Design an enzyme around this catalytic site. Structure first.
Site, PDB file in Angstrom:
ATOM      1  N   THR A  78       2.311   1.961  10.953  1.00  0.00           N
ATOM      2  CA  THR A  78       2.058   3.416  11.102  1.00  0.00           C
ATOM      3  C   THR A  78       0.545   3.636  11.108  1.00  0.00           C
ATOM      4  O   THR A  78       0.121   4.782  11.159  1.00  0.00           O
ATOM      5  CB  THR A  78       2.667   4.128   9.949  1.00  0.00           C
ATOM      6  OG1 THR A  78       1.977   3.708   8.769  1.00  0.00           O
ATOM      7  CG2 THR A  78       4.141   3.742   9.834  1.00  0.00           C
ATOM      8  N   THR A  79      -0.294   2.606  11.040  1.00  0.00           N
ATOM      9  CA  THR A  79      -1.773   2.781  11.163  1.00  0.00           C
ATOM     10  C   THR A  79      -2.243   1.938  12.323  1.00  0.00           C
ATOM     11  O   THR A  79      -1.676   0.877  12.605  1.00  0.00           O
ATOM     12  CB  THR A  79      -2.423   2.271   9.871  1.00  0.00           C
ATOM     13  OG1 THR A  79      -1.816   1.007   9.534  1.00  0.00           O
ATOM     14  CG2 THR A  79      -2.194   3.270   8.778  1.00  0.00           C
ATOM     15  N   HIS A  85       4.783   0.928   1.046  1.00  0.00           N
ATOM     16  CA  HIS A  85       5.064  -0.071   2.098  1.00  0.00           C
ATOM     17  C   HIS A  85       4.755  -1.412   1.517  1.00  0.00           C
ATOM     18  O   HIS A  85       3.592  -1.779   1.291  1.00  0.00           O
ATOM     19  CB  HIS A  85       4.131   0.174   3.307  1.00  0.00           C
ATOM     20  CG  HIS A  85       4.579   1.386   4.042  1.00  0.00           C
ATOM     21  ND1 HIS A  85       3.808   2.006   5.003  1.00  0.00           N
ATOM     22  CD2 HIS A  85       5.731   2.097   3.961  1.00  0.00           C
ATOM     23  CE1 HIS A  85       4.467   3.031   5.516  1.00  0.00           C
ATOM     24  NE2 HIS A  85       5.611   3.145   4.871  1.00  0.00           N
ATOM     25  N   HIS A 101       0.872  -1.180   0.000  1.00  0.00           N
ATOM     26  CA  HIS A 101       0.000   0.000   0.000  1.00  0.00           C
ATOM     27  C   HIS A 101       0.892   1.208   0.000  1.00  0.00           C
ATOM     28  O   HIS A 101       2.112   1.110   0.156  1.00  0.00           O
ATOM     29  CB  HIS A 101      -0.987   0.004   1.210  1.00  0.00           C
ATOM     30  CG  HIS A 101      -0.272   0.030   2.515  1.00  0.00           C
ATOM     31  ND1 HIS A 101       0.161  -1.126   3.135  1.00  0.00           N
ATOM     32  CD2 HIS A 101       0.169   1.070   3.273  1.00  0.00           C
ATOM     33  CE1 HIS A 101       0.773  -0.780   4.254  1.00  0.00           C
ATOM     34  NE2 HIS A 101       0.811   0.538   4.363  1.00  0.00           N
ATOM     35  N   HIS A 141       1.127   5.587   1.248  1.00  0.00           N
ATOM     36  CA  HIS A 141       0.686   6.775   1.996  1.00  0.00           C
ATOM     37  C   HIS A 141       1.096   8.000   1.183  1.00  0.00           C
ATOM     38  O   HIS A 141       2.198   7.997   0.594  1.00  0.00           O
ATOM     39  CB  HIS A 141       1.374   6.850   3.367  1.00  0.00           C
ATOM     40  CG  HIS A 141       1.217   5.626   4.218  1.00  0.00           C
ATOM     41  ND1 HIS A 141       0.166   5.532   5.116  1.00  0.00           N
ATOM     42  CD2 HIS A 141       1.841   4.418   4.228  1.00  0.00           C
ATOM     43  CE1 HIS A 141       0.263   4.367   5.765  1.00  0.00           C
ATOM     44  NE2 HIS A 141       1.213   3.624   5.176  1.00  0.00           N
TER      45      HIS A 141
HETATM   46  C1  LIG Z   1      -1.086  -3.644   7.759  1.00  0.00           C
HETATM   47  C2  LIG Z   1       0.130  -2.942   7.814  1.00  0.00           C
HETATM   48  C3  LIG Z   1       1.307  -3.623   7.882  1.00  0.00           C
HETATM   49  C4  LIG Z   1       2.524  -2.922   7.938  1.00  0.00           C
HETATM   50  C5  LIG Z   1       2.528  -1.525   7.922  1.00  0.00           C
HETATM   51  C6  LIG Z   1       1.355  -0.846   7.854  1.00  0.00           C
HETATM   52  S1  LIG Z   1       1.358   1.014   7.835  1.00  0.00           S
HETATM   53  C7  LIG Z   1       0.133  -1.551   7.799  1.00  0.00           C
HETATM   54 ZN   LIG Z   2       1.795   1.735   5.679  1.00  0.00          ZN
END
Ligand SMILES: Cc1cccc(S)c1
Ligand SMILES: [Zn+2]
Length: 257
Positions: free
Chosen positions: A195-196, A116, A91, A93
Protein backbone atom coordinates in the site's frame (compact mmCIF):
# COMPACT_ATOMS: atom_id res chain seq x y z
CA UNK A 1 9.14 12.60 -3.23
CA UNK A 2 6.10 10.74 -2.15
CA UNK A 3 4.24 11.11 1.13
CA UNK A 4 0.76 11.64 2.57
CA UNK A 5 0.25 15.45 2.16
CA UNK A 6 -1.82 17.49 -0.30
CA UNK A 7 0.98 17.69 -2.82
CA UNK A 8 2.62 14.33 -2.62
CA UNK A 9 -0.14 12.04 -1.27
CA UNK A 10 -1.93 8.99 -2.67
CA UNK A 11 -3.64 10.89 -5.51
CA UNK A 12 -0.14 11.82 -6.83
CA UNK A 13 1.67 8.55 -6.53
CA UNK A 14 0.67 7.25 -9.99
CA UNK A 15 2.93 9.77 -11.73
CA UNK A 16 6.14 8.20 -10.31
CA UNK A 17 4.58 4.73 -9.82
CA UNK A 18 2.10 4.02 -12.60
CA UNK A 19 1.29 0.62 -11.08
CA UNK A 20 -0.79 2.77 -8.64
CA UNK A 21 -3.62 2.33 -11.23
CA UNK A 22 -2.83 -1.42 -11.76
CA UNK A 23 -5.07 -4.47 -11.70
CA UNK A 24 -4.38 -5.68 -8.12
CA UNK A 25 -3.81 -2.65 -5.93
CA UNK A 26 -4.27 -2.45 -2.14
CA UNK A 27 -5.97 -1.72 0.16
CA UNK A 28 -9.59 -2.57 -0.69
CA UNK A 29 -12.89 -2.42 1.09
CA UNK A 30 -13.92 -5.89 2.29
CA UNK A 31 -17.62 -6.29 1.58
CA UNK A 32 -18.44 -9.04 4.11
CA UNK A 33 -21.65 -10.00 2.47
CA UNK A 34 -19.92 -10.80 -0.84
CA UNK A 35 -16.74 -12.40 0.41
CA UNK A 36 -17.48 -16.05 -0.01
CA UNK A 37 -16.50 -18.73 2.51
CA UNK A 38 -13.87 -21.02 0.95
CA UNK A 39 -13.81 -24.46 2.69
CA UNK A 40 -10.60 -25.35 0.78
CA UNK A 41 -8.62 -22.74 2.75
CA UNK A 42 -6.18 -24.73 4.99
CA UNK A 43 -5.89 -23.43 8.47
CA UNK A 44 -3.43 -20.45 8.96
CA UNK A 45 -0.09 -21.26 10.77
CA UNK A 46 1.70 -18.39 12.47
CA UNK A 47 4.97 -19.66 14.06
CA UNK A 48 6.62 -16.75 15.84
CA UNK A 49 8.25 -18.58 18.85
CA UNK A 50 11.74 -18.10 17.45
CA UNK A 51 11.27 -14.57 16.04
CA UNK A 52 14.34 -12.37 16.56
CA UNK A 53 13.77 -8.69 16.38
CA UNK A 54 16.75 -6.44 15.84
CA UNK A 55 15.92 -2.80 15.42
CA UNK A 56 13.19 -0.18 15.00
CA UNK A 57 13.46 2.49 12.28
CA UNK A 58 11.53 5.69 11.53
CA UNK A 59 11.64 5.72 7.68
CA UNK A 60 9.84 8.99 7.27
CA UNK A 61 6.56 7.19 6.31
CA UNK A 62 5.99 4.80 9.29
CA UNK A 63 8.23 2.88 11.67
CA UNK A 64 9.48 -0.60 10.99
CA UNK A 65 10.29 -3.25 13.60
CA UNK A 66 12.89 -5.36 11.75
CA UNK A 67 13.66 -9.07 12.22
CA UNK A 68 16.69 -11.23 11.48
CA UNK A 69 15.39 -13.20 8.50
CA UNK A 70 18.75 -15.00 7.81
CA UNK A 71 17.39 -18.32 9.18
CA UNK A 72 14.23 -20.33 9.22
CA UNK A 73 12.45 -18.54 12.17
CA UNK A 74 9.14 -16.72 12.38
CA UNK A 75 7.14 -18.20 9.50
CA UNK A 76 3.69 -17.90 8.12
CA UNK A 77 2.21 -20.79 6.20
CA UNK A 78 -1.11 -22.55 5.55
CA UNK A 79 -4.27 -20.53 4.91
CA UNK A 80 -4.23 -19.56 1.23
CA UNK A 81 -0.43 -19.94 0.90
CA UNK A 82 1.69 -22.46 -0.92
CA UNK A 83 4.99 -22.89 0.91
CA UNK A 84 6.56 -20.86 3.63
CA UNK A 85 6.89 -17.15 4.15
CA UNK A 86 9.49 -15.63 6.51
CA UNK A 87 8.85 -12.55 8.68
CA UNK A 88 11.04 -9.61 7.82
CA UNK A 89 9.37 -6.58 9.44
CA UNK A 90 6.17 -5.15 10.79
CA UNK A 91 4.79 -1.61 10.66
CA UNK A 92 1.56 0.20 11.18
CA UNK A 93 -0.68 2.73 9.39
CA UNK A 94 -2.78 5.08 11.58
CA UNK A 95 -4.92 8.17 11.69
CA UNK A 96 -4.94 11.66 13.27
CA UNK A 97 -8.30 10.75 14.93
CA UNK A 98 -9.62 7.44 16.20
CA UNK A 99 -12.28 7.39 13.40
CA UNK A 100 -9.77 6.77 10.64
CA UNK A 101 -6.37 5.14 10.13
CA UNK A 102 -6.77 1.70 8.69
CA UNK A 103 -6.05 0.94 5.01
CA UNK A 104 -8.44 -1.94 4.54
CA UNK A 105 -11.99 -1.22 5.54
CA UNK A 106 -14.77 -3.72 6.46
CA UNK A 107 -18.15 -2.73 4.99
CA UNK A 108 -16.65 0.78 4.65
CA UNK A 109 -15.74 0.88 8.39
CA UNK A 110 -12.35 2.42 9.10
CA UNK A 111 -10.45 1.24 12.13
CA UNK A 112 -8.06 3.53 14.11
CA UNK A 113 -4.94 1.75 12.73
CA UNK A 114 -3.74 -1.33 10.91
CA UNK A 115 -0.74 -3.56 11.59
CA UNK A 116 1.13 -5.15 8.63
CA UNK A 117 3.38 -8.19 9.39
CA UNK A 118 5.42 -8.59 6.21
CA UNK A 119 6.70 -11.99 5.08
CA UNK A 120 8.58 -13.14 1.94
CA UNK A 121 8.29 -16.46 0.12
CA UNK A 122 11.38 -18.45 0.95
CA UNK A 123 11.38 -20.14 -2.54
CA UNK A 124 12.79 -16.79 -3.84
CA UNK A 125 15.76 -16.68 -1.48
CA UNK A 126 15.44 -13.11 -0.13
CA UNK A 127 13.07 -10.16 -0.03
CA UNK A 128 14.55 -8.35 -2.97
CA UNK A 129 13.99 -11.30 -5.35
CA UNK A 130 10.58 -12.07 -3.80
CA UNK A 131 9.22 -8.55 -4.74
CA UNK A 132 9.85 -9.44 -8.39
CA UNK A 133 7.21 -12.19 -8.16
CA UNK A 134 3.45 -12.18 -8.00
CA UNK A 135 3.42 -14.54 -5.03
CA UNK A 136 6.55 -13.10 -3.40
CA UNK A 137 4.92 -11.61 -0.23
CA UNK A 138 2.34 -12.52 2.37
CA UNK A 139 1.11 -9.71 4.62
CA UNK A 140 -0.86 -10.47 7.77
CA UNK A 141 -3.06 -7.38 8.32
CA UNK A 142 -4.55 -6.79 11.78
CA UNK A 143 -6.92 -3.93 12.68
CA UNK A 144 -6.59 -1.81 15.78
CA UNK A 145 -9.46 -0.26 17.70
CA UNK A 146 -9.16 2.08 20.66
CA UNK A 147 -10.33 0.63 24.01
CA UNK A 148 -8.32 -1.44 26.45
CA UNK A 149 -4.49 -1.27 26.20
CA UNK A 150 -2.56 -4.05 24.39
CA UNK A 151 0.17 -4.98 26.86
CA UNK A 152 2.18 -6.60 24.10
CA UNK A 153 2.40 -3.28 22.28
CA UNK A 154 3.79 -1.22 25.11
CA UNK A 155 7.49 -2.00 24.42
CA UNK A 156 6.98 -0.52 20.96
CA UNK A 157 5.17 2.57 22.23
CA UNK A 158 7.88 3.17 24.84
CA UNK A 159 10.74 3.24 22.30
CA UNK A 160 9.08 5.76 19.94
CA UNK A 161 10.54 8.77 21.80
CA UNK A 162 13.99 7.55 20.64
CA UNK A 163 13.04 7.48 16.94
CA UNK A 164 10.94 10.60 16.67
CA UNK A 165 12.25 11.74 13.32
CA UNK A 166 12.98 10.38 9.84
CA UNK A 167 16.16 8.32 9.65
CA UNK A 168 16.42 7.58 13.38
CA UNK A 169 16.78 3.93 14.50
CA UNK A 170 17.11 2.16 17.87
CA UNK A 171 18.18 -1.33 18.95
CA UNK A 172 15.00 -3.32 19.45
CA UNK A 173 15.88 -6.87 20.43
CA UNK A 174 13.76 -9.66 21.96
CA UNK A 175 10.38 -8.18 20.96
CA UNK A 176 7.80 -10.96 20.69
CA UNK A 177 5.23 -10.26 17.92
CA UNK A 178 2.90 -12.97 19.28
CA UNK A 179 1.72 -10.28 21.77
CA UNK A 180 0.17 -8.24 18.88
CA UNK A 181 -2.12 -11.09 17.68
CA UNK A 182 -5.86 -11.31 18.46
CA UNK A 183 -7.42 -14.59 19.77
CA UNK A 184 -8.95 -15.72 16.49
CA UNK A 185 -7.08 -16.28 13.20
CA UNK A 186 -10.32 -16.12 11.06
CA UNK A 187 -9.41 -14.03 8.02
CA UNK A 188 -10.26 -12.69 4.54
CA UNK A 189 -7.77 -13.16 1.74
CA UNK A 190 -7.22 -11.64 -1.71
CA UNK A 191 -4.30 -10.87 -4.12
CA UNK A 192 -3.00 -7.34 -3.86
CA UNK A 193 -0.04 -5.05 -3.47
CA UNK A 194 2.11 -2.98 -1.08
CA UNK A 195 0.00 0.00 0.00
CA UNK A 196 3.12 2.31 -0.17
CA UNK A 197 5.26 3.11 -3.14
CA UNK A 198 6.64 1.24 -4.98
CA UNK A 199 3.19 -0.34 -4.77
CA UNK A 200 4.45 -3.71 -6.05
CA UNK A 201 1.84 -6.40 -6.89
CA UNK A 202 3.37 -9.22 -4.93
CA UNK A 203 1.19 -9.65 -1.92
CA UNK A 204 -1.26 -12.38 -0.76
CA UNK A 205 -3.19 -10.39 1.79
CA UNK A 206 -4.49 -12.20 4.84
CA UNK A 207 -6.64 -9.73 6.87
CA UNK A 208 -7.77 -10.94 10.28
CA UNK A 209 -11.42 -10.41 11.15
CA UNK A 210 -10.82 -9.79 14.89
CA UNK A 211 -9.25 -6.43 15.72
CA UNK A 212 -6.90 -5.96 18.66
CA UNK A 213 -7.69 -3.27 21.19
CA UNK A 214 -5.08 -0.57 21.99
CA UNK A 215 -5.52 2.29 24.38
CA UNK A 216 -6.11 5.86 23.51
CA UNK A 217 -2.70 6.62 25.23
CA UNK A 218 -0.90 4.00 23.05
CA UNK A 219 -2.21 5.41 19.76
CA UNK A 220 -1.61 9.00 20.92
CA UNK A 221 2.08 8.08 21.20
CA UNK A 222 2.15 6.95 17.54
CA UNK A 223 0.76 10.34 16.61
CA UNK A 224 3.75 12.14 18.32
CA UNK A 225 6.17 10.70 15.72
CA UNK A 226 7.35 12.95 12.90
CA UNK A 227 7.53 12.53 9.10
CA UNK A 228 10.28 15.16 8.96
CA UNK A 229 13.95 14.70 9.92
CA UNK A 230 15.59 16.25 12.95
CA UNK A 231 16.02 20.01 12.58
CA UNK A 232 13.16 20.35 10.08
CA UNK A 233 9.72 21.91 10.64
CA UNK A 234 7.61 19.43 12.64
CA UNK A 235 5.04 17.47 10.63
CA UNK A 236 3.25 14.92 12.79
CA UNK A 237 3.30 11.33 11.45
CA UNK A 238 -0.47 10.89 11.20
CA UNK A 239 -2.79 9.74 8.42
CA UNK A 240 -0.15 7.54 6.77
CA UNK A 241 -2.84 5.39 5.14
CA UNK A 242 -3.84 4.90 1.52
CA UNK A 243 -7.60 4.78 0.88
CA UNK A 244 -9.37 1.80 -0.60
CA UNK A 245 -8.66 1.06 -4.32
CA UNK A 246 -10.83 -0.52 -7.03
CA UNK A 247 -11.40 -4.25 -6.52
CA UNK A 248 -11.32 -4.91 -10.29
CA UNK A 249 -11.27 -8.53 -11.29
CA UNK A 250 -10.79 -9.88 -7.76
CA UNK A 251 -12.65 -12.08 -5.28
CA UNK A 252 -12.15 -11.82 -1.53
CA UNK A 253 -12.40 -15.19 0.19
CA UNK A 254 -13.37 -15.85 3.87
CA UNK A 255 -11.73 -18.55 5.94
CA UNK A 256 -14.85 -18.79 8.20
CA UNK A 257 -18.60 -19.17 7.88
C1 LIG B 1 7.50 -2.86 2.55
C2 LIG B 1 6.14 -3.25 2.59
C3 LIG B 1 5.80 -4.56 2.46
C4 LIG B 1 4.45 -4.94 2.49
C5 LIG B 1 3.45 -3.97 2.65
C6 LIG B 1 3.79 -2.67 2.78
S1 LIG B 1 2.47 -1.38 2.99
C7 LIG B 1 5.15 -2.28 2.75
ZN1 LIG C 1 1.83 -1.33 5.22
Amino acid sequence: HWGYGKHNGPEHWHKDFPIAKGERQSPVDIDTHTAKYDPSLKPLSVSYDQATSLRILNNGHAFNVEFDDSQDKAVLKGGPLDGTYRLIQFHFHWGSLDGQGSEHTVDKKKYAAELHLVHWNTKYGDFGKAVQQPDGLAVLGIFLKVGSAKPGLQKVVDVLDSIKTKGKSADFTNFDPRGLLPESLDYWTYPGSLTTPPLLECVTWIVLKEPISVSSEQVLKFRKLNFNGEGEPEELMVDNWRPAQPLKNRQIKASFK
